[PDB]
Design an enzyme around this catalytic site. Sequence first.
Site, PDB file in Angstrom:
ATOM      1  N   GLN E  10       0.892  -1.008   0.050  1.00  0.00           N
ATOM      2  CA  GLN E  10      -0.032   0.032   0.048  1.00  0.00           C
ATOM      3  C   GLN E  10       0.833   1.300   0.090  1.00  0.00           C
ATOM      4  OE1 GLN E  10      -0.746   2.358   2.510  1.00  0.00           O
ATOM      5  NE2 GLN E  10      -2.490   3.332   1.209  1.00  0.00           N
ATOM      6  N   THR E 169       1.644   2.636  13.692  1.00  0.00           N
ATOM      7  CA  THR E 169       0.372   2.451  13.275  1.00  0.00           C
ATOM      8  C   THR E 169      -0.060   1.113  13.450  1.00  0.00           C
ATOM      9  OG1 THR E 169       0.828   1.697  10.825  1.00  0.00           O
ATOM     10  CG2 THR E 169       0.758   4.075  11.409  1.00  0.00           C
ATOM     11  N   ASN E 196       8.975   8.075   8.902  1.00  0.00           N
ATOM     12  CA  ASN E 196       7.862   8.764   8.888  1.00  0.00           C
ATOM     13  C   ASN E 196       7.822   9.718   9.775  1.00  0.00           C
ATOM     14  OD1 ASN E 196       6.182   7.620   6.704  1.00  0.00           O
ATOM     15  ND2 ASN E 196       5.981   5.775   7.852  1.00  0.00           N
ATOM     16  N   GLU E 244      27.670   3.771  -9.506  1.00  0.00           N
ATOM     17  CA  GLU E 244      28.384   4.704  -8.413  1.00  0.00           C
ATOM     18  C   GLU E 244      27.915   4.532  -7.076  1.00  0.00           C
ATOM     19  OE1 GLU E 244      29.652   5.165 -12.188  1.00  0.00           O
ATOM     20  OE2 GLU E 244      30.968   5.583 -10.459  1.00  0.00           O
TER      21      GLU E 244
HETATM   22  N1  LIG Z   1       5.472   7.486   4.274  1.00  0.00           N
HETATM   23  C1  LIG Z   1       4.413   6.819   3.833  1.00  0.00           C
HETATM   24  N2  LIG Z   1       4.035   5.373   4.659  1.00  0.00           N
HETATM   25  C2  LIG Z   1       3.112   4.678   4.013  1.00  0.00           C
HETATM   26  C3  LIG Z   1       1.953   5.137   3.273  1.00  0.00           C
HETATM   27  N3  LIG Z   1       1.339   4.019   3.285  1.00  0.00           N
HETATM   28  C4  LIG Z   1       1.696   2.959   4.173  1.00  0.00           C
HETATM   29  N4  LIG Z   1       2.670   3.233   4.822  1.00  0.00           N
HETATM   30  C5  LIG Z   1       3.507   2.669   5.864  1.00  0.00           C
HETATM   31  O1  LIG Z   1       2.929   1.320   5.814  1.00  0.00           O
HETATM   32  C6  LIG Z   1       2.580   0.886   7.050  1.00  0.00           C
HETATM   33  C7  LIG Z   1       1.822  -0.192   7.237  1.00  0.00           C
HETATM   34  O2  LIG Z   1       1.759  -1.072   5.865  1.00  0.00           O
HETATM   35  P1  LIG Z   1       0.549  -0.738   4.845  1.00  0.00           P
HETATM   36  O3  LIG Z   1       1.222   0.142   3.868  1.00  0.00           O
HETATM   37  O4  LIG Z   1      -0.694  -0.184   5.413  1.00  0.00           O
HETATM   38  O5  LIG Z   1       0.253  -2.025   4.130  1.00  0.00           O
HETATM   39  P2  LIG Z   1       1.320  -3.384   3.617  1.00  0.00           P
HETATM   40  O6  LIG Z   1       2.795  -3.027   4.049  1.00  0.00           O
HETATM   41  O7  LIG Z   1       1.204  -3.647   2.422  1.00  0.00           O
HETATM   42  O8  LIG Z   1       0.726  -4.633   4.550  1.00  0.00           O
HETATM   43  P3  LIG Z   1      -0.712  -4.920   4.607  1.00  0.00           P
HETATM   44  O9  LIG Z   1      -1.641  -3.907   5.590  1.00  0.00           O
HETATM   45  O10 LIG Z   1      -0.765  -6.100   5.503  1.00  0.00           O
HETATM   46  O11 LIG Z   1      -1.377  -5.275   3.394  1.00  0.00           O
HETATM   47  C8  LIG Z   1       2.354   1.867   7.972  1.00  0.00           C
HETATM   48  O12 LIG Z   1       2.860   1.695   9.399  1.00  0.00           O
HETATM   49  C9  LIG Z   1       2.880   3.088   7.297  1.00  0.00           C
HETATM   50  O13 LIG Z   1       3.924   3.766   7.850  1.00  0.00           O
HETATM   51  C10 LIG Z   1       2.715   6.175   2.623  1.00  0.00           C
HETATM   52  O14 LIG Z   1       1.555   6.402   1.791  1.00  0.00           O
HETATM   53  N5  LIG Z   1       3.626   6.930   3.007  1.00  0.00           N
HETATM   54 MG   LIG Z   2      -1.164  -3.332   2.891  1.00  0.00          MG
END
Ligand SMILES: Nc1nc2c(ncn2[C@@H]2O[C@H](COP(=O)(O)OP(=O)(O)OP(=O)(O)O)[C@@H](O)[C@H]2O)c(=O)[nH]1
Ligand SMILES: [Mg+2]
EC number: 3.6.5.-
Lengths: 51, 426, 426, 43, 427, 427, 45
Positions: E10, E169, E196, E244
């Site tokens: 995601q 989170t 983050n 590099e």
């Molecule tokens: N900086 C940043 N971090 C993100 C973003 N989207 C998700 N995260 C990070 O991803 C972490 C959790 O994973 P998710 O992106 O929600 O989903 P996933 O890693 O594919 O794992 P699942 O939820 O089980 O599908 C969160 O703690 C966020 O810190 C984003 O758009 N920007």
């Molecule tokens: Mg996810």
Amino acid sequence: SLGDALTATHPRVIEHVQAQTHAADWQSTVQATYRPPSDATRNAAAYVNTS
Amino acid sequence: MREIVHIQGGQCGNQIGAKFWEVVSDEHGIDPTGTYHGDSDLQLERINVYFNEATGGRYVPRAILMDLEPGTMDSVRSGPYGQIFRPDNFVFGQTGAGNNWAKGHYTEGAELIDSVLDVVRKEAESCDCLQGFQVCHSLGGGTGSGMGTLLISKIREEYPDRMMLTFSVVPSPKVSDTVVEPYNATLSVHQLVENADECMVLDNEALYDICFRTLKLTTPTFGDLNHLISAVMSGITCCLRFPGQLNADLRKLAVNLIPFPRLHFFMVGFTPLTSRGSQQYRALTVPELTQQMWDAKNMMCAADPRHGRYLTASALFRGRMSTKEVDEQMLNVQNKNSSYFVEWIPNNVKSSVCDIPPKGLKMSATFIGNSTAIQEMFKRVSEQFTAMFRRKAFLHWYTGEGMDEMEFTEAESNMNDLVSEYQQYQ
Amino acid sequence: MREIVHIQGGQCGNQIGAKFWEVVSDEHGIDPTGTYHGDSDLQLERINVYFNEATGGRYVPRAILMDLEPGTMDSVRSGPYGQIFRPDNFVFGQTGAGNNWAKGHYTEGAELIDSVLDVVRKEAESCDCLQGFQVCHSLGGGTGSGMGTLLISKIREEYPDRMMLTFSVVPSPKVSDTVVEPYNATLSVHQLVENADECMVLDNEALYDICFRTLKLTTPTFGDLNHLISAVMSGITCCLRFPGQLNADLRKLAVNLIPFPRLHFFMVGFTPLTSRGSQQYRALTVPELTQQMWDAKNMMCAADPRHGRYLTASALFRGRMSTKEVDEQMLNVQNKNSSYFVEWIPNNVKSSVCDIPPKGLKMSATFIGNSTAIQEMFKRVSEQFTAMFRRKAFLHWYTGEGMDEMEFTEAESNMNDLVSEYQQYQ
Amino acid sequence: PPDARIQKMRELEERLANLKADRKVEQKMVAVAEFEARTTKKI
Amino acid sequence: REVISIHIGQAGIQVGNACWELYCLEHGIQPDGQMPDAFNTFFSETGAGKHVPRCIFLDLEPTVVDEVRTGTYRQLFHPEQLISGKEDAANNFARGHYTIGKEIVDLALDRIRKLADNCTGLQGFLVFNAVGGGTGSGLGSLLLERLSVDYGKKSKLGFTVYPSPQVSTAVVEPYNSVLSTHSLLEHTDVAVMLDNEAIYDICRRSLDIERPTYTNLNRLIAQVISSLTASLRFDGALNVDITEFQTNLVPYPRIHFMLSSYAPIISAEKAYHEQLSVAEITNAAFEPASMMVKCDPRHGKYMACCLMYRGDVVPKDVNASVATIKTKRTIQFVDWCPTGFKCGINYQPPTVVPGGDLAKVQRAVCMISNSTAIGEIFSRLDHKFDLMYAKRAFVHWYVGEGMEEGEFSEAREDLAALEKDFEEVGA
Amino acid sequence: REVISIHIGQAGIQVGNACWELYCLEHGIQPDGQMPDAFNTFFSETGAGKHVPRCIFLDLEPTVVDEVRTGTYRQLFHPEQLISGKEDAANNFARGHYTIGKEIVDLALDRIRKLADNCTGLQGFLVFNAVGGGTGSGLGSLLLERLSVDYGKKSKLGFTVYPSPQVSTAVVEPYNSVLSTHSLLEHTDVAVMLDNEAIYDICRRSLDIERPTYTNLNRLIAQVISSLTASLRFDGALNVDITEFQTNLVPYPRIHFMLSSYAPIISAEKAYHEQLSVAEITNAAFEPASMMVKCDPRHGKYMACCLMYRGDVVPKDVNASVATIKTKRTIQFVDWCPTGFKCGINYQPPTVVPGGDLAKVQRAVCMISNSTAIGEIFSRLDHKFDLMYAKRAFVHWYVGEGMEEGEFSEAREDLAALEKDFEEVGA
Amino acid sequence: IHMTDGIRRETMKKETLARERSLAAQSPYMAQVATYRARNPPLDH
Ligand SMILES: Nc1nc2c(ncn2[C@@H]2O[C@H](COP(=O)(O)OP(=O)(O)OP(=O)(O)O)[C@@H](O)[C@H]2O)c(=O)[nH]1
Ligand SMILES: [Mg+2]
Ligand SMILES: Nc1nc2c(ncn2[C@@H]2O[C@H](COP(=O)(O)OP(=O)(O)OP(=O)(O)O)[C@@H](O)[C@H]2O)c(=O)[nH]1
Ligand SMILES: Nc1nc2c(ncn2[C@@H]2O[C@H](COP(=O)(O)OP(=O)(O)O)[C@@H](O)[C@H]2O)c(=O)[nH]1
Ligand SMILES: Nc1nc2c(ncn2[C@@H]2O[C@H](COP(=O)(O)OP(=O)(O)O)[C@@H](O)[C@H]2O)c(=O)[nH]1
Ligand SMILES: [Mg+2]
């Protein structure tokens, strides 16, 4: 003879008439953040093409 | 895509499910005649989770109706959004249980549970990617607790991978409705702990004083209470139905709330809740939702979280917002009252965000709490069970159906073991 | 072109044929007065198979009505679509058999079959290429069982190469009208097993069950059962009357369902069949047809296929459809319950597609299954026959007409060897 | 005989290596041929 | 010369959505796929007037993937390049690594094989993912090890998202992060850290955005990736390529973890205020307040640094700035590496996005270096992992999904060995 | 260059029933015994076109022996090797070692004497047993002791099947196991462990059968034994005889307990999905997911390793794979052993049997090692044996047979001494 | 069997009655929804 089971029950429990967002106003964050760059007119201040 | 099959049992379950389906149908913009009449296209892309398209936009809910006394089906059908439920989904007996777990679990369920299994199977393979099962019923009654719990056991046996989520109402000290609450409740929870995946406990007194303080209603009949329960029910699954910034399905919240297989008893609340005369006070801001979410008066169980320690918590946010403020408020509430949280786990709180607030709101949040203070309700049930079982009062109605006292011994011992574990982890 | 000539026997056969002809006339767009009033040109090219041009767009059905009592003919003429039958086709005796096989097979048949043979030979030679014969009758009555059987044997002696269908209803012990039903049923079956080309067994109790559970009707008169039988019969010869993506004539069905010539007893079902209340809430897809076609409770015979083996199977399909989905569903049903199909014949299901559905419908289906569970009802009749014949009850009415004990003994002998071979192939 | 199957794979591998080397040479020729034309257009 | 990038999870596909918006905008590609030679490294030209990105979006949840499919860029992306599973992994390494990952990685690598076959001058891979979840970490590590088996010799730049120390989170992210590092150690070539909390503080401090969201974070990550790829994309006074980063910034094969910084991080109104120049933008890229990872470099010791320069940059100014930095004693370099700087200059200034809050700057600097505070970050994560593993919490999920407790201890010991290695090197 | 086999107990003779079928289909000999130089190590040519296995099936119950007599392999074995007792040891070590063994062991010995006399270059013996049972524990120990007295200097392949910790069919099998280990520890020179749940996991994961019976376990054990003996039966580019095993796998006279493994283990449909090389089968031979015994080798340190390769392997790739395995940091060897490996290549690939669940693979790997995890297995068994012994459960039938407390105390103390030896040699 | 037919008859009758009551009660709910929808004015972009 009838009971009181037929109640609107939406205005009595959950409603905020001043702060409602109409269903036509619904939009996802990505929808509101990635606009067509050619005709983006949702921002007050932007770099105008100056030839 | 990911499919939720709804199951309704008993009078309480049937009415709360009718309210839930009314709220869901309103949210997806379909009128009580079964046709879509909304405006935003965001609704149609995720209607398969709760509805099936038959002919000409006729979206039929994916629910099962179950009871034994005609009055509850008559009430469900007579009200609005009653002619949208499938006529074949009203699988239904005729004799009635009447406050007896044994009657609803061994005799009536014997010749009624097969038809409901056929219906649930036919309706389960109807969808491609089944996500899990969501059931709502009662515990102090006979038909909802016993027959519903046996159906829970059967569908856990046949479908051992698909998830199971329960909303159950539990007995209360002051508002005690029937007389055989302990006998039914103990065996219901005894089966639930070994078969249900996660349970969210409900009780009528918490809803009662929620209507007292927050809403300041004068005569809050069952409609408002069922509407609140339905609002939480819809808020749980809002991730599967709408796009968001960080989605969290049922498994994502279950893995973030269950550290041990028997540690699956949660407590719930809903924000925001204000009276009609106080609609202009509160600004829909993250701190204002957070301060109401963590208050003990907003909880929907007769269990003070201040008398125990939070083990894990979940927050389901809806509507356009900023992640930084939500995360900052979560860290702030974790740090200040740190004595109310467990020590051997960091980051007890899980968060999720969606961009679509429920209709009539601007943004909402749903709280699921796996607190160790829920053992107080179980100790309250156990003391009444032990006192009433002491001289075998009302026992002959149970052993006269096939049961033995050994089942009562097993239920009491198992629930005592569960309260021992909850006290241990405090 | 290919020609189907209709033969009706007894009161049951006459009512069934009246309903069948009404349904077919509705399909081809001719009014109850006999004049064509349809819209599409597809309703003209293949109507020679059932009708004959008289004058000015008047079409007369290719039917011969048989009975021994004036009541059946009078009711046929009185009802709607009763003014399209040619009066010369109303071959008619006077005295009546009256629930006695011997009267309709030896005495009354002698002076009546000559006129029936005359009329059937006159009509059959009128058409150029007779596809085959079609007979609907009963095994309970006298003029339907005995006279119909004598006519069947006479046609088999006269026109040997032509095809022959037999829609014969067999009485059941649960729904039993006549006392002497086993005496007629066993001997009629004994003659059918060598005379008829292929037999599809109907039963009134199965039709009652279908109209109770599926159609949810409260007063299932003979009209509804005759409507179901007429729809089934019309569905069989749909490919002859309309173009399709894969056509299949009667011989093409017979060759794919009869691996041994003495096994020609099929069990039949129809789909879709829904109640009017539940008509809105169903989507109309190929899986919805396939899942109901294979259901045991949808079969119009008094034999459960789950107690036996699907030796061969067939399926007729009507409507603008996808062949890929039909084949995928057939393979899925073949490979899911592999224990219900015989091992030495792979790919036991024969499929055909017609693009013209019945009026008022978009999709339909028909099932013709040659199962080895059809021998359940044969034993259920032979046990009553042996129990009553062992004491020579009602025998003096059969012996004192020309028949003797040898016909009876050979009757249960052939009954036993047929059921024994059916059990052997299981 | 004890190394016949091994000899087969040896021949297979050497032939494939020669073919891949030839393909790399062809790729080099294509690259220089395109380079000349694009530079001429730029000039 | 070309590079193909993969986005997992995601977070990965959202940062890819921002990044490809930036890529389309900077080369002047309108969102339907055609112009109104430098684009060749990202957009493949097909037919007549049509460009397709060299990327794949994959995830086990179809919601956000198909929402991107129905966003502004519908015709831009190839329909088969957006892989989407049917059900989530739900914050579980095991679910995305053994159960559901087994039947999705084959399709992903089948598509990557033909994407690379269409290419002719491939430099390497470039992965965006997040290890705090299940869909990202598990199948990203699985795909990484499979590509290491298939190609191996091609570089793989890593841009991961670890959980922040205080702000978080999820609950069970330590397990996923630890088992993700257990494979990122031997399969990732150059790892570039992204937190983050640090970017939240950067947005609140520099861009004075009181209520930032993930979109600004992804926009800044796109800025960084574009600034570090512009050397390959456009011609400059001193060009650098993918090799590099490995040659000049990876001293030991087991030590590849990078710190990112960007300057000038300024809003649209303050570009009026300040007089931009090489010296102060180079100086600003070294304070911890301008670093995209929440760590203090004072407690650590630098080994090697890389500096990308865009816009009107004259080499004498950057030489003077780096000389002044070297003479500064507030930061300390290791006597181990006497020459720990790497520079690169590209002529085109960074582009701006309509609706973004970053102003049009004359010049910008992206600073990517190696330090030892990364061992401190890993040690801090290990502390709370050990404090939580003591009670056998949440283990049954992983065990039932198909795993066992052994690899938890093995990855813990691998992280401990990493801690020992970084402690030894820092001496 | 020959070796003869004996079979004791239900499991041993069923494994032999699988093994001889596999061997006959290896050497192209029909069950009648006629072929329509390599076979000389197991078959002796009799008459005109007949071959007889160098085998003897021994058991106390007559049942399984008489279905062996009445099965398809009637004419394969000479009938008078098929030796049947009259009444079983009934899972009783004392009964099988003192009551019934005293009258059958003589016939076994004067049969082994003539079986060896027919041989000329007998390298050793190979036995098949499970120490969980009664007859495979007691009289097997007595018989092998009598051979040790008779021969002494001759090798004896001890192929034992130990009971799994969790999965168990009997209740007194810890006592039988301990009483067997009392004698097998200082009598046989080579002993191999065979756990039951590990093979269950092997056939569940890779062989993807959810309903495995004993036949498949016997088939794969026969494949392992055939792979071990292929260096004997056929000439390879690098051959090893039985004798090198003792001097290359046994560092101390009391530590002789070598684990087993095999690779690749693939079903009929997996063989088409991937193509094979040497590196991945070398790696897959060391992962515990393909090990034959319930153990955690990651907890312990290796002593030495024997690697038999069959099919199409050249020494260069095996040397490279050995170097890579040594450079890996997941497994660690003991300090005093600088090289704990032993390779081997045979030209003839492993065979497959119609009706079996294995595929036609170009090359295969048989892995046999030595580590300290076997000490953990011994301690695990000893703890549960002492757990019962504290209340004298089931001991009194052993007492009434003629035995006493003394051997039980001595066996517990000897196992404790073995535990101390295992923990001291690992330092 | 008489019990089964009586059950069928009562089920059909009560289906018809429930349908009639639902159609009767639908309209006031629609009026109420209209009344509390009139409170929310859609925005103009
Ligand atoms: N900086 C940043 N971090 C993100 C973003 N989207 C998700 N995260 C990070 O991803 C972490 C959790 O994973 P998710 O992106 O929600 O989903 P996933 O890693 O594919 O794992 P699942 O939820 O089980 O599908 C969160 O703690 C966020 O810190 C984003 O758009 N920007
Ligand atoms: Mg996810
Ligand atoms: N691998 C394998 N092990 C077996 C088989 N049959 C039995 N065993 C093992 O042998 C142990 C017990 O001995 P058995 O083989 O059943 O019989 P036994 O060795 O002759 O001893 P008794 O039954 O007392 O006469 C059990 O714990 C099993 O684990 C088999 O077919 N294959
Ligand atoms: N909140 C809520 N509770 C209800 C509702 N209907 C019934 N109940 C509760 O359910 C309990 C009775 O359960 P009952 O209907 O007898 O269960 P059954 O016999 O198994 O069908 C009472 O204590 C009520 O408080 C409802 O609509 N809302
Ligand atoms: N399905 C069906 N069965 C019928 C009909 N009419 C009569 N029967 C059955 O036929 C049986 C009696 O047949 P009968 O009238 O004696 O035939 P006949 O004497 O040969 O003319 C009864 O058991 C009825 O159930 C009909 O219209 N449809
Ligand atoms: Mg035995």
